[model samples]
Target chain A: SGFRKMAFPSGKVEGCMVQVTCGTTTLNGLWLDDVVYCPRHVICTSEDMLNPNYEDLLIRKSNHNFLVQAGNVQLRVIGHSMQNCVLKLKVDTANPKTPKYKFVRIQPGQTFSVLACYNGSPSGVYQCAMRPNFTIKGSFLNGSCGSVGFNIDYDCVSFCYMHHMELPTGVHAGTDLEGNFYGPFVDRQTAQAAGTDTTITVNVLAWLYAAVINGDRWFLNRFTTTLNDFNLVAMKYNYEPLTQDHVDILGPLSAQTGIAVLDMCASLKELLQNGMNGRTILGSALLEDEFTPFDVVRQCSGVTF
Target chain B: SGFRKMAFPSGKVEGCMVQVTCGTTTLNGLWLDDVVYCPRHVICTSEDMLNPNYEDLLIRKSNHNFLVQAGNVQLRVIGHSMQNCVLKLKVDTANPKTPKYKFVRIQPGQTFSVLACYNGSPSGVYQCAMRPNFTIKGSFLNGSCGSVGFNIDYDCVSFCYMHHMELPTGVHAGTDLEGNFYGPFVDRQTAQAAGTDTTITVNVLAWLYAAVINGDRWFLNRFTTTLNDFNLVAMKYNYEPLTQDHVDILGPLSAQTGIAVLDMCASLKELLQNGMNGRTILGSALLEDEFTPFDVVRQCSGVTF
Candidate 1:
């Protein structure tokens, strides 16, 4: 009862069939709609605006093909059919693996309207598609529950955050004038909150380092391999590979950091095995002093050699 | 005339041949001689004191073996034969490839005795044998020069000075209450001199270390082989081998001293090759600060591992 649900507009009823008439948009981009196509709520597609009618069908006519458009979240769907009819759409819930759906209705008609939607959001991918909802008697034509189809493929583009250095290895090890930063978080909301930065990037970096140093062969192998691959990609862009000679020049720093990692891993592993759940796992500052200019090499797991 | 000479005594003379019957002493021991049986000069055997009398030959008889004795610088000779006999001796000079000799003369009755000499004091070994002094009708009995062969082995019984830590590897590297020590010197008189510890053992230790560091195969091979030999001898004497681990525990003192040897060797090698003769060659104090207790390892050249 607490979740607010949007209502469908008049011309957006269900089971008013439409034929496939268009193609999909670019995989990633961003756009916006000036207005909500759905009058009662914020529904963008015309399919989610109308009421359902059993016998009202849109006829096939290519030259006069009908089109339903929405805001960038779900762009456009087009078709030609026997009679004027409504379109229906369904959306998946948060768990893509779980089976849960949210449905909407839309009416057939185009009267001074524009549809806009985003291919992706700051959080994740935006997905929407149409299905037949109208039916005739016991024998439904292309309006049965199974007649799930789409016409024009319109999509809002996907986007990454503006911070390009949001990769695992790209995290900075400490704070500065701007306050603490831990690179990418589970979601934008969590990352923006204050007083949580200390528990994020630093812990992750420490764990990654510790896992490698404690004779975690699998982790070390995968880590070094990934670094090697990254170096290859970097080399394609004319960047030098991270190498052992560089680490050697850094002297005992690498060795000290390695010891820190080993210590951290042992303590952390014990704590974790003992089931100290929901608590701050990365509470130690023992390895803080070990971080240095060459720590980037360590962070990237480029220290195996 | 400037050279002091000791007079030969009477009881040390003729027919009193020490039988050429006894042998010489081992070259390196301390022994005291009671008498020299020659008058006027040093006489090892009767041949140098006997007078010429061809017909009055002393018969060869083991029971009638005449004996004469002299102090150890030289030893006895044999034979009971008349005058016209020749005396001969052989000496081993330092250069086995070359031949040199020292000779002496005797008359029918040696009222006076004079022994010839050598250029350098320790030039060679003197070996003597005797035959009758005069020839009968120019054909002396048993008068062939070859007949005057060594009947007894008489050697000058060489001596080395008494500072005997004298094991093959027992050499000191520096000075103090130990008195301006260098491991080995060419002679004893030189070692006993005042204020002339010009040669430094530092350079040697330095070069040995440098050779190891530079991976100079020949030098390393020789050094290690010598160390192994030393260790073997040490083991036989129930002492432990000198080891790298031990040196490492002793810290940078050993390492720095080793560097001193390397530098010394380089400079000395260059100087020697460039022909800096007659000058004090081994001269440098670079490793002075690096002298440590374990420096004996370097001194003994036991730094291989």
Candidate 2:
């Protein structure tokens, strides 16, 4: 049997872009033109659909899972969940346990929340998310149960539509943070004669999202932007902070993997600045690539101040 | 004689701050309260300002200038310059060599310049700075000859006055990017109930200035901000990118060292976000420190995409 790389249609494929996943375990790949151009999968099976027996070869025929082929892959050995999953937000703190946050459902895009303290006089704040089922789990699931109190804080959202790109796939792909209909970037000339403002927007968005993943507390839920103050800037996509270890607990894949804007990362900006230079800030990567790995240039440069 | 850390009179100095220099060899220090509280410096040669006869030293009396003591400072030995110098802007292209960029004397803060080519008909663009005298030396001094052509591009600038910190000292510290009389940030409560907007502005400003130093070309001359939309945001400090080896060539420090806006960097943002969690995205550093080392967090978290 023969195999080829996965292709995403490009108007004119220029540099590389990575394939995003739900958690931190993304495919750090290279893209050429349309098809993926990296150490893609090698069908070690199909000759028998089964590799040598670990627990006795009953693995799927083309399961590129479990073992490494050319050294670019990580080995795995066991049945786990969340191979593909989607995240959703729900409202219900009725307790098998005491409620921490009392939710007041407002309009579609907004939620008025109340902090309710059942027992403690507490200063116990957390970056809590509903995992597996809609149970508010503190940042880490180490079994210290029950939060202090629930207080009401309102949430409001706004959105933007980038021009010239495909919307990515996973949960809530079509929903804006405001719960309104969100759409894809259209094909158009970005109005940037003076480009720094646009560049910063791109940079900040990427950085904040990375902060969300890295657990930088200040950046939590900070995914916001001005409605009229951008080339259509918007807030962050809904996030669930699950590390690679906890990725298996995920539910299933929805309409999108990540927000189209964040996924594009600095790619669009690179394409614009170096319209002709193939060595854009977007190859194996450049200063802009800091968005993903987060802040590599800083490490390379080293600042102690 | 005794040594005390340099003090800059803080209202009630809290976390930390590092001293700024015109080159890359900065003191990776920490600030505590009103004084620098890090691995400061210790006098290594009081009894021997003049060392063994390899070369009798006339080393300045209190030259914290060189040498490591207590494992904090780097050792020093020669008579170098730029230990304390500032950067300035000048426009005179009467060259010992043919001019690369011809100048059009404009009003004040703005420049309308033309790119002049003598020999080549091809492309030769660079991140040039006036070294020693006002002759344009290409980014690196590899003796690259004249650039291609002279073309004019008009530059316009806008500014913001932060409301709290003193204006940093260096060239045109009091002048806005537009050459107008730029003022200082007054003491006022930053109106950021929904804080992300402010965080990005602070982050972007810090990051762009770092980019300027790290030689990210897209960042050059991009220190601009919108007039009608900001909480007193502004552009970058004027910079003359000379490596430490060449720091002595700096003409002199002007009214300021760095832009006050950039000097504050993520410091102000930290004070607001946590207000209590002293561990704000600031310290020996945090994700925000990515501004200086350019992108350290990214390096720490390596990215391929």
Candidate 3:
């Protein structure tokens, strides 16, 4: 269970400020434009900042309502809680294992001030109150919790970017809470020319079967065209199209090697691209020597994704 | 079956030399030691030599055994065999579909110089011999066929180096006929300190299961420690230790994504090393904010070898 409303000290609370630390960088701020915005700090913070590690911290600000924000690191008040009232902060009782604390000498009004830091705590809920008298209590205000603090948001964004190019339109978009963008679009012509749709279909098959479409009609046509005078060579060698038996064999081996069929296909694509792009004459010699069916099979099997 | 040996011309088979074409470079030589060695060419060879590809080539020397050598690209003779003989080179019949060849006026007494290049041919057996007026003869000196020609030996050596670091002592060693060497050794202490053996075990698991051992006791320790002062934080939240179920869930996803467990462990080792080496304080905030459990899981899942 999560933290619930705790009794607030009987008084007209003016305003509140919360400071959270993400590694060595402390984010001090108050409610601005419906979100907490940390104003730049004037004093030089610690040079030995903490490395970015994913932890959780929760900050609950109180005025008329308890507005709580959780983060992986810690959140603390800067100097003092300007409110001049005793503050009692306790982890939600539902989880007796959350962090708990009490403080006085309130010097609240400050920018980038420390409220409380989850510097050394696990993920849980904690509540803060203006009145530390411990006895006097009233209808308490509690806000929802959110894992906040550090900059794990960027990693998610980068991940989206890396995988997004392969995703179809309207599948997934990149975001940063306030603004969202679906980006890094592939050029229409480029995708089409590269037979992107077909390759994508094969990619899906590779995932489903842990195998590849090694000798499809389209594949032969594309590859034969890429390799200089491959049609003649194929005829000379009595080349036959790939069979189901061949496809069937790919799955187990791919699964065994943690080498996905997609990876193999990607490698083939790169190999062909490298050859066709004038890097070398992908003539009969190269094919027989480097890109033989057996070689392809072995290469695919050895590939680690 | 492979090609058998043919009788040499009735005369002193003076030191013979063979010349083969690899792209633009020509390999010309005779028995230097136990094997043929092609010293550097006078003219500049292809600086952009494509990495060797694996394909069988059989060059049956007259004196004995089928010297089998393979190569990536094609290699053909320059001007003539330089050994006045009516040679008959044919693709092996087993694959009636392999590369075929024709004979010509091969000059005699020249270095076993360049012959016809198989710039476009599959693996097969070919027989060459001497004749009086370039006349025909029977398949007499057809000794046991050997898949010879072109050198496809180094690939194995490199593969050994890449994997040998994980192998035990007295294991596979490298060789080139003349000498043998066990190489690319990793320092014992460095490897052990990083739990290289454990990682190697998981790497084997990745190969066998076609999936990675995504979770292990040490992986958790390293990962947790990297994430906020995990021990304290874990206790604070009453966080239970990683369960078997949690660990089990990692394998399938890792396999599906082709991410190997070894890569994850290696990355963790690097991360910790970078931090503890007086680089920065890997405190709770950093870990919680930057290295979240989900992020690590996602990263491990997406890793490719």
Candidate 4:
């Protein structure tokens, strides 16, 4: 089989300059020509963006025949004045007889996978395409519009066989990739030190199992202590790739959808560097209300690299 | 360049398998030779994999002036044995007679970049390689030993800057390839009951931002609803590439270290679906000891794409 183009621009990306509008409010500009998926379903300007057809987008598909493994999915659009973007999935092949399927009314960075299979075939590479809609009206041209593009790399090969086969009803949940197991354990002495490597071991166990369940292709890393030779060895033992799409997919799907990729790295490193350094990096819809996001202090102020 | 001759399956990597060992702990057999670095690092069950002298590998010329970027320097054992994985640098790439540099111990998986200039003269490309090392130890070898081979994808690069003018440090903490600003918001009853359109808008914003910050090339899908479609459009507006040694360099880093990716996804989806999905991903390590390491569940459950 020929290899398709599969890539996510980390340094360079779409949505760099985005202009969003909700009712009378105007948002800034960002990327618009990439794929974004999240483990989420809603957003900030939901009412303004949805208004009449919000019901259609929020409805869950009841097709039992279609099964998708657990993971997030997302896509981006390009438009000067756009509204009402739709996600279309053509099953088997782009040929009409191949069973062209559509997912319907997708969010920019929301994460989602096919819920129904075509021709009783749940596993195979499927070509996915998109069709976006935009309009203009009276006054300042109140309207909706969207952009569309295609890539061979975005091919979807259902991992049902490799993954735990099952058709879940609702959004599935799991843990982030921190490997700390034990620690944060305290004795009765509130004034004395009461912690061990127990939590760290347990966390490490988490790292081990995540690899086992998620498949071995993913990469893993840790950010605790000095990133010297020993620590690197430990990371090598357990590593998984953090696809840029995963980040986009999780962003909107997550409560605090504004999670930055750098922040995610910092969060992981902080979690591993616990105990002595005691720096914990975890913030989002999952984190408690008070925790802060990961912030890497610049080497020098007023100096942007 | 000529695609670096540093081919795989070298001496220590014969048959394309590196050697590894676990000392005398417990006897277990798992294929160990999967990656190997160039140059050479010895592997011993209980002995030393350290370099007799750091300067043995390669040395930068003397009387050179140079500057190291912030997040572009990392060190690894180059070989599988995890010995003498130290990195040294000097700021003086000029002089052609004397050299001044700073040496820092690098950790495995830490993403970084290097610039070697010759005493303020135009920077030249100098090659550095790591000799292969392979060995997997499982039994009490007592004195017995086995060979393990590893496949190391060293994606390091050398660039020549024609303009020798004072260049700013080309290192700054990178951002999340997929992150949304609208998200990371507090979920409340008002936010939930605000109606479908409002919810859809918020969801769209979150996914779009997430995709931009996290990193994704393109998005494709048929919309099941207007909300989904809007998300796709909003995100597609911006796109960029996060390339370079991203794969090999970032590969060894850990996955979601602090927060569990699943729970984070779940929590965000919940907040969007309901109203209470607020606060953050996990609780604070300082105040709340109730929260669990997200990575724990991920590893244990083996969840990932």
Stretches off by above 4 angstroms in model 4 are A1-9, A14-19, A24-80, A83-305, B1-52, B55-84, B92-305
Model 1, residue B181: distance off in Å is: 78
Give lDDT tens digits, candidate 4, residues B1-305: 00000111111111111112222211111111222221111111223322133243223222121112212331222222212321122222221211122222221111112111121111101111110110000111111111111222222111111111110111111111111111121111112111111122222222322322233212211222333333343334321111232222222122422222222233333333343312221111221111012212221222211
lDDT per residue (tens digit) for residues B167-239 in model 1? 1221211111112122322212123222222222332343334323323323222122333444454344333
Question: What does candidate 2's lDDT look like per residue over A1-305, in tens digits?
Answer: 00001011111111112232211122222222222211111112234222323122223422233231112323222222111111111112111212122222122111111111111111111111111121221111111111111112111111111001111210111112121222221112222121111122333334333332323322122232222322322222112221332122111110122433423333333333343222211111122211222121121122111
Query: What lDDT score belongs to each candidate, Candidate 1 first?
Result: 0.22, 0.20, 0.22, 0.20
Q: B175-241 in candidate 2: lDDT tens per residue?
A: 1112122222111222211111112232233443333333332313323223222233222221222
State iRMS for model 2. Answer: 25.0
TM-score, candidate 4, first chain: 0.18
What TM-score does chain A of each model score against the native chain A?
Answer: 0.18, 0.17, 0.18, 0.18
Q: Candidate 2, after superposition: displacement of residue A77 in Å?
A: 9.3
**Model 4 chain B weakest 10-residue run by lDDT:** B131-140
TM-score of each: 0.13, 0.19, 0.17, 0.20
Model 1: per-residue Cα lDDT over A1-305, one tens digit each: 00000011101111111222122211111111211111111111235224422222222223223223322223242321221111222212121222111121321110001011112111100111110111100111111111211111112111111110111221211111111112222211122222221212122333444434332323222122333544454344332343444334333433645543333333433433342332221222122211223332332322211
